[PDB]
């Protein structure tokens, strides 16, 4: 289980524990998965998506049953295999981001570019630049949100945790059905209860009994 990000990432002055990343509460390193919506024209191939998220094109290709050079239709959700490891008490997958245009902000990078796979707070925590002092060409360390199964999760047969970007009209019920797991397992993975609010566009952890499907 990890705490639910719970829209705390929408305000850069928010300092809730969850905005700084999943907490290192299990094994030091593991296979994990991100999800990401293909965006044209910058991030719509395995090479460009893997460049943004620091995966490999072949891992993205095999995870989605495509070739490593196939274009991906815009808004297609793709799974991205990543290594998840502990760093300073947090689970995260490290990536790098070179700012393209002056005008980008810590929030625009977390919310738009990385589609809430990281947060304003974590970017600011792990980068020396001031929020007012970002420019085109600056290199940013990007802590992407991932986690490793706890002993209790592993004992129940969950081999991976997947970071799922929730879309409009989805619910814990519908998301669990995509991955062949019980709804309660998804709630438990995010320390939610049957009577909780889940937000569109916020990452949600999904425990997996096997590798995710090739198409979501």
């Amino acid at each position: 289980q990890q705490e639910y990000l719970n829209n705390n990432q929408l305000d850069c002055d928010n300092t809730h524990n969850s905005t700084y990343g999943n907490v290192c509460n299990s094994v030091t390193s593991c296979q994990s998965y991100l999800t990401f919506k293909s965006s044209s024209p910058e991030y719509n191939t395995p090479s460009s998506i893997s460049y943004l998220l620091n995966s490999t094109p072949s891992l993205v290709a095999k995870s989605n049953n495509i070739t490593d050079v196939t274009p991906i239709i815009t808004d297609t959700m793709v799974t991205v295999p990543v290594t998840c490891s502990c760093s300073g008490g947090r689970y995260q997958h490290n990536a790098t981001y070179n700012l393209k245009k002056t005008g980008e902000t810590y929030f625009s990078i977390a919310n738009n570019t990385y589609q809430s796979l990281t947060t304003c707070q974590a970017l600011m925590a792990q980068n020396p630049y001031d929020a007012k002092n970002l420019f085109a060409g600056d290199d940013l360390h990007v802590p992407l949100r991932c986690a490793c199964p706890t002993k209790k999760q592993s004992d129940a047969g969950f081999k991976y945790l997947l970071t799922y970007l929730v879309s409009q009209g989805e619910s814990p019920d519908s998301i669990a059905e995509i991955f062949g797991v019980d709804t309660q397992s998804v709630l438990d993975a995010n320390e939610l209860d049957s009577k909780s609010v889940v937000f569109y566009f916020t990452p949600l952890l999904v425990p997996l009994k096997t590798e995710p499907p090739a198409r979501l």
Epitope: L10, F199, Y200
Partner: nanobody, 121 residues
Framework: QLQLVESGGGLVQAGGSLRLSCATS????????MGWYRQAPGKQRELVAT???????NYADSVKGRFTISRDNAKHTVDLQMNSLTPEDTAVYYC???????????????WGRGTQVTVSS
């Protein structure tokens, strides 16, 4: 969409107190202002207190000092502590939750089914 569950009303002696609470569940993009309204017999549904996500409050004049609104952003609940009640506080009390379903989209009213509060003479 969103489901609201109100609790904590009932019958109370004048001068007594009650605690109303409302829990929200379901899905949305953002939960904005939450609040409590009331409709006395023969009256309109009128604002009692609201509270924003950043805890900015707004109280009806007839209610300032006696009532206190609170908000739990971890579990998405809103509570109304009602002290020094009078028969003029007898009403059906409704929780209001405002939500948005996309970035910069319209805001929607979500109303609970209402909880009866009756204050005896």
């Amino acid at each position: 969409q969103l489901q609201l569950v109100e609790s904590g009303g009932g019958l109370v002696q004048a001068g007594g107190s009650l605690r109303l609470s409302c829990a929200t569940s379901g899905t949305t993009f953002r939960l904005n202002t939450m609040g409590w309204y009331r409709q006395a017999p023969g009256k309109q549904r009128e604002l009692v207190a609201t509270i924003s996500r950043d805890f900015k409050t707004n109280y009806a004049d007839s209610v300032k000092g006696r009532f206190t609104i609170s908000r739990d952003n971890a579990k998405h609940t809103v509570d109304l502590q009602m002290n020094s009640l009078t028969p003029e506080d007898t009403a059906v009390y409704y929780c209001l939750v405002r939500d948005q379903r996309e970035w910069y989209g319209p805001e929607y009213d979500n109303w609970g089914r209402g909880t009866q509060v009756t204050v005896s003479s």
